[PDB]
Symmetry: D2
Subunit: 110 residues, 4 copies
């Protein structure tokens, strides 16, 4: 740790006569999934903060309808639309309906 060395190899003697040593690297706690799964609820009248991030992102719009602004281009989305945002694309959703927009969001590091 202080100088970052890995422990010395413990070699296994294999039946063939070969020797095999596996490097013992640090462990860490991770999610079973290589992505983050979330739900976004946008009430009526809400505009989300303009998002931009290196993680890639998918939106599965489940309910409601809104004006997506994607890199300056406005378009309407609704329940049943599915969207993919490449790294760093600027996205923002304005819900101009009475009922909430419900979104399943998935994001992951490229």
């Amino acid at each position: 740790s202080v100088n970052g060395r890995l422990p010395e190899l413990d070699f296994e003697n294999r039946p063939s006569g070969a020797k095999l040593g596996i490097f013992d690297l640090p462990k860490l706690e991770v999610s079973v999934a290589p992505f983050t799964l979330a739900h976004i609820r946008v009430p009526g009248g809400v505009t989300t903060a303009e998002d931009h991030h290196e993680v890639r992102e998918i939106w599965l719009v489940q309910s409601g309808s809104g004006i997506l602004t994607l890199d300056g281009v406005r378009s309407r989305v609704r329940a049943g639309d599915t969207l993919y945002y490449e790294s760093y694309r600027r996205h923002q959703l304005h819900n101009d309906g009475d009922s909430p927009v419900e979104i399943v969001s998935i994001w992951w590091r490229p």
Copy 2:
């Protein structure tokens, strides 16, 4: 919610300054290596023939010392120090050290 139904817990929603709400699904956790590969050293003494390998992980061999005869999908070829090999998934490989010196290999394996 439990392992018997596989059901994930109810979401806890956070309020964002915009008025939107964000809930993150709480998935199960796991202890894994800091590395998405396995790093290994293989030493093949003089006269040894490794076991014929046939596995799903991709594999890189950085041959460091010595020399021997790689058999790769039935094709015989010589490999020596400074060679670097890449074995696509499920390719049969087997090394016979016909020298007197050990062949030393840094091996990297990972799931496609």
Copy 3:
């Protein structure tokens, strides 16, 4: 390819005096996502085939209701439930309603 050798290294001379050679590995076409995203529609009366696979899997049940059998244990799921299936758990869904069960499925290699 015939003997699997990588091409010889092309070393770059760095301003420090060090040399850096990067190994040129084979390329391949992949999805931008490290998982597969799908939709499963189970009509009324349908029972899905008993699934089992090494990939991990999440179901986001969007609509309808059914009897999940998970490793021999029966339970009811509905729209709004979200499920995680570890590698090799046996899952199967019977839709005993009039209307279809709609599921967003995500699977990925552990």
Copy 4:
């Protein structure tokens, strides 16, 4: 569906023998390495000091030949052939070869 709305195409559903229907979302594709890491050789001639590195990728150094003085987050230490080092993300590292021989390193880097 296009890049201007980011919208994915409508699903094409397949009938399964059970009566269920399966549609797979068609996501965009990309050319990547067969390996989830970058594999490199670093050669530090006698007297050379590498640039101080400070980056997000994790890094493994398999020192093969020679010897020098690693500086790791301001701590000076000697590294020699046969040493294997692991640099967690954003750890400052810099190698000074105070010998006459080159230090040769197999370096592996990857995104946490």
